[PDB]
């Protein structure tokens, strides 16, 4: 679970799990860190 987070999520190509301390959203649509830079709807999405 550390190796999965290694790197930066906001770097295109790096599919790093964002570091979420203790915050596990219940609504997976209204999740933490999923809007601006995670959907091209919000002006850009981090590249794959």
């Amino acid at each position: 679970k550390q190796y999965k987070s290694f790197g930066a999520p906001g770097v295109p190509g790096s599919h790093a799990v964002p570091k979420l301390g203790n915050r596990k959203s219940a609504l997976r649509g209204r999740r933490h860190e999923n809007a601006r830079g995670r959907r091209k709807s919000r002006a850009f999405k981090v590249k794959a």
């Binding site: 964002p18 219940a26 209204r30 601006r36």
Partner: protein, 151 residues
């Protein structure tokens, strides 16, 4: 050994910095309180790069918001077909191998509501649960057993 002989110190680096004037924080750029903001200050102005690079999906709003989100009616621990035959006393697994009878697996007894269909099944068993995937149903039906919807 010799390394084990050194069960020493409680604040090693702080007590080691005694005698050095800047205390490990530099002479040019002092250690001054809040030189960049308090908390997540500046996420869009002077920590814009940091927020973009380490937390992309920050700064937005997405999805249907659900007032009074009940989670007990959504609670549904899942298991898999690979973890079924572990839940049968292998005396039954042995006395039912080629014969027609199939042992009964009650997932609610162990705390699983849905059954997911990953993992192969060796012999048909009867699985009582609250939900099944169509993959789990397909694998159980082909192995010979049956899925049962149970309250």
């Amino acid at each position: 050994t010799y390394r084990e002989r050194k069960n020493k110190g409680q604040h090693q680096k702080t007590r080691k910095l005694r005698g050095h004037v800047s205390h490990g924080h530099g002479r040019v750029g002092k250690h001054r309180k809040h030189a960049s903001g308090r908390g997540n200050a500046g996420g869009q102005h002077h920590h814009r790069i940091w927020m973009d690079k380490y937390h992309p999906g920050y700064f937005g709003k997405v999805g249907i918001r659900r007032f009074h989100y009940r989670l007990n009616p959504r609670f549904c621990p899942t298991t898999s077909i690979s973890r079924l035959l572990r839940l049968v006393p292998k005396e039954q697994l042995e006395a039912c191998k080629g014969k027609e009878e199939l042992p009964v697996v009650n997932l609610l007894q162990h705390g699983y509501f849905k059954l997911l269909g990953t993992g192969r099944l060796s012999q048909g068993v009867i699985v009582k649960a609250r939900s099944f995937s169509q993959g789990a149903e397909r694998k159980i039906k082909k192995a010979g057993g049956a899925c049962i919807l149970v309250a």
